[PDB]
Amino acid sequence: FILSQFNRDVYKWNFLDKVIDIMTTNFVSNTIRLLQPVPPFSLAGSKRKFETRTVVNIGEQLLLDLELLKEIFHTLPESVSNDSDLRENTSYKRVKRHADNNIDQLLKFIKLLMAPLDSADDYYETYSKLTNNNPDSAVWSFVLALKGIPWDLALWKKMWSAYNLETNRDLFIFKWDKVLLGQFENNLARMQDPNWSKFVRQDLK
Ligand SMILES: [Ba+2]
Ligand SMILES: [Ba+2]
Ligand SMILES: [Ba+2]
Numbered sequence: 001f002i003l004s005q006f007n008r009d010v011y012k013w014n015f016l017d018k019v020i021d022i023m024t025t026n027f028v029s030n031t032i033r034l035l036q037p038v039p040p041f042s043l044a045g046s047k048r049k050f051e052t053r054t055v056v057n058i059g060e061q062l063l064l065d066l067e068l069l070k071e072i073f074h075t076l077p078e079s080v081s082n083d084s085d086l087r088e089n090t091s092y093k094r095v096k097r098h099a100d101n102n103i104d105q106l107l108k109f110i111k112l113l114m115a116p117l118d119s120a121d122d123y124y125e126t127y128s129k130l131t132n133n134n135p136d137s138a139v140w141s142f143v144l145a146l147k148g149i150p151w152d153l154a155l156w157k158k159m160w161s162a163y164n165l166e167t168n169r170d171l172f173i174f175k176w177d178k179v180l181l182g183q184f185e186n187n188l189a190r191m192q193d194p195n196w197s198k199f200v201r202q203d204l205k
Helices: 008-035 052-079 090-113 120-131 137-147 153-166 172-176 178-189 194-204
Strands: none
Touching: 008 052, 008 090, 008 137, 008 172, 008 178, 052 090, 052 137, 090 120, 090 137, 090 172, 120 137, 120 153, 137 153, 137 172, 137 178, 137 194, 153 194, 172 178, 178 194
């Protein structure tokens, strides 16, 4: 027997939990659809829709969006409370920590999109910092592609070498749109160029 399903108070907080995740997912999906590379991938079937400098600017704008979002989240609890004696609820805090948690991730994700690509080393320092040392190469790649880098194998290896040299599955921000990452992975294996083909299957995997 399950009694919590008939409790209006338990529900309202679960609902805010859902609103939170919905908004987080939209923020993530829109960002990716915006910035992601257009299949088929190659130096042809290109240039990239945006230069990396512009992606950085975009990142900057998302920070202001993220800020407004944060405020919306801090506001949700007030929508379910007529009684605002809020030292509790052991449930309210759960909601607050949840909002705070999602914002942090977004923040990292964006901070990461805004990172410069001047040195492969400096980029590694911040990539591992911001993803908590995520060893996944597909994630790494999607991120880099999202950053706006063109399909320059020389530059990719330039970037990758530093990463590789220093490095259950953690999908980072893609926790929120597994499918887009999956498609990205597929498109990447479908590259016609033999070098790329070899770079993908042997160097990245
Ligand atoms: Ba600028
Ligand atoms: Ba109220
Ligand atoms: Ba290694």
